[PDB]
């Protein structure tokens, strides 16, 4: 389902066709249609990318990645920057706390995770624009 | 060669043993069946020949098959009962033409009529309309007579015979002590 409670059509289709691999195994390729990345968006302008750094009321070591083998009580701020927002648990959306000293702040109070924009409170110079990547595996 | 089915209908009434004509001409027309089946065998041995009578209770004596070795035996024991039956005699073969093995074999049915016809002109035009409708080659052979030979049978053939080009022929034999083999072999149907 989505954040508002509505269910995604390509997610249900992707999971049912994903369960339809019993008769035809190559049908499992439709699982990518149900991949919904969990993150936040603080994009203010279409061509300008800002940097929003909040803080979590939980331990940062408890939310780290389970690094496998090699085989050759509170964090100061979150790890989400340049917005590269990482994964976020739906239970983590209640422990986020925006900093009071943050230069920028949206108009809508960020309470639950979703897609929102950023409002320029300073309306001054030094918007901190960052460049874009280059050719490689992607376009 | 020629791919067609042959059906013969012989009379089993007691009208075939009168001493005025041939001495029990049943054997003579049996030899006619022999020379037409051996002649068609010499032309195309893949032709099937059936045997059935025109009695009241029609009985298929031999199924359509090119093997005449047992047909020669089945030509005997004619069981001389009954007088004549025309409707189920036509319907017993013209409708049975669909049971043949080779679908490419054309439809050809002959009949040996030794008794006067009991059906009126209405049945003659209904059956002639049915046979002209389904387009089956019909050769009428009338052996022996009591009344005039062809009075309504003329219009029966003219209304039954379609496709005037190389169509069917009518065989009318006059009285005479000579054999019937050379007289019925004169048209193009034999050979």
């Amino acid at each position: 389902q989505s954040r508002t409670g509505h269910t995604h059509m390509p997610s249900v289709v992707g999971v049912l066709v994903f369960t339809q691999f019993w008769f035809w195994f190559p049908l499992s390729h439709f699982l990518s249609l149900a991949y919904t990345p969990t993150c936040v968006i603080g994009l203010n302008k279409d061509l300008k990318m800002p940097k929003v750094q909040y803080k979590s009321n939980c331990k940062p070591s408890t939310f780290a990645y389970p690094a496998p083998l090699e085989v050759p009580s509170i964090t100061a701020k979150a790890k989400k920057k340049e917005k590269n927002p990482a994964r976020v648990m739906p239970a983590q959306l209640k422990v986020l706390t925006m900093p009071e000293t943050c230069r920028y702040q949206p108009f809508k109070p960020l309470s639950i995770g979703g897609i929102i924009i950023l409002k320029d409170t300073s309306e001054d110079i030094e918007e901190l624009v960052e460049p874009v990547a280059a050719h490689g595996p992607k376009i | 060669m020629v791919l067609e089915s042959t059906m013969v209908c012989v009379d089993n009434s007691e009208y075939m043993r009168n001493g005025d004509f041939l001495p029990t001409r049943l054997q003579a027309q049996q030899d006619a069946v022999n020379i037409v089946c051996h002649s068609k065998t010499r032309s195309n041995p893949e032709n099937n020949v059936g045997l059935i009578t025109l009695a009241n209770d029609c009985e298929v004596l031999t199924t359509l098959t090119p093997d005449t070795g047992r047909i020669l035996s089945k030509l005997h024991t004619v069981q001389p009962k009954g007088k004549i039956t025309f409707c189920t005699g036509i319907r017993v073969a013209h409708l049975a033409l669909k049971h043949r093995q080779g679908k490419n074999h054309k439809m050809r049915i002959i009949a040996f009529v030794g008794s006067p016809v009991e059906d009126n002109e209405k049945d003659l035009v209904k059956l002639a309309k049915r046979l002209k409708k389904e387009k089956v080659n019909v050769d009428i052979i009338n052996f022996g007579e009591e009344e005039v030979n062809t009075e309504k049978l003329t219009a029966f053939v003219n209304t039954l015979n379609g496709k005037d080009g190389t169509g069917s022929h009518l065989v009318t034999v006059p009285p005479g002590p000579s054999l019937a083999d050379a007289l019925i072999s004169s048209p193009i149907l034999a050979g």
Partner: protein
Amino acid sequence: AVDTAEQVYISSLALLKMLKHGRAGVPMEVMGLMLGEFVDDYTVRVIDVFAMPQSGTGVSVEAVDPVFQAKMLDMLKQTGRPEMVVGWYHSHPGFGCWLSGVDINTQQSFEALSERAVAVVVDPIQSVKGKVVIDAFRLINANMMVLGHEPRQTTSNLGHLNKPSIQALIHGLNRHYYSITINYRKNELEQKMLLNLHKKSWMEGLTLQDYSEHCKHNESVVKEMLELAKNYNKAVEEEDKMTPEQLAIKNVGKQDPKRHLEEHVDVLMTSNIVQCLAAMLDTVVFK
């Protein structure tokens, strides 16, 4: 070099013909021929199945008479059976359903025309009447030993193909000799005709004949079964008199595998026939 996932469709025609052919499945080697139509690559359907006369040689390529085979097939072609042969079947009593060298040689010789060449071996001699599970056999290419043995997709049905899990024949001779899955099919005419035919095969003619027979035998014959039933009931109660002593002493663990409950429940079920048929006598007496 291509392979698909094939599955053999088995109707009740070939099944019942293999059951009558299994009744005629004498120790002597028997022969049979399967027919059908090939619609696509990975499906095969059998419709026509007949038997073959036995011979002193048994299952062999010399026993198959081509003029008799082609003669009967032609007689099926002149009738409403326009299906070509799809395979040949036989019976292997006693020594197992596996295929000897002669069978794989006549299979190699008979598979030159049909690429599928379905082979079925029925063996009802040592098989119990509880299950009629039958299996279809296949021939693998000798040049596929370098590459994978069976590159068959849809590996789900292999769990249903794992039911014949004998530890000597399947993987005891699985090299160069594999098998294929089997499914069934039943239309509504077979379902209602055979279903109502079997229910009627367990029912009466008018369905009202043998009811009053038991309704009135409850007073003549079943009375003996009721007295004997009470003799078994008391014959267990004589031990149930001793049960409250052990149950009054130990109360820990169970040592007697007898339950003494479900048997008496069944006795009550046999005793309820009088109650269920009393209303039947009420209907026969009423109207």
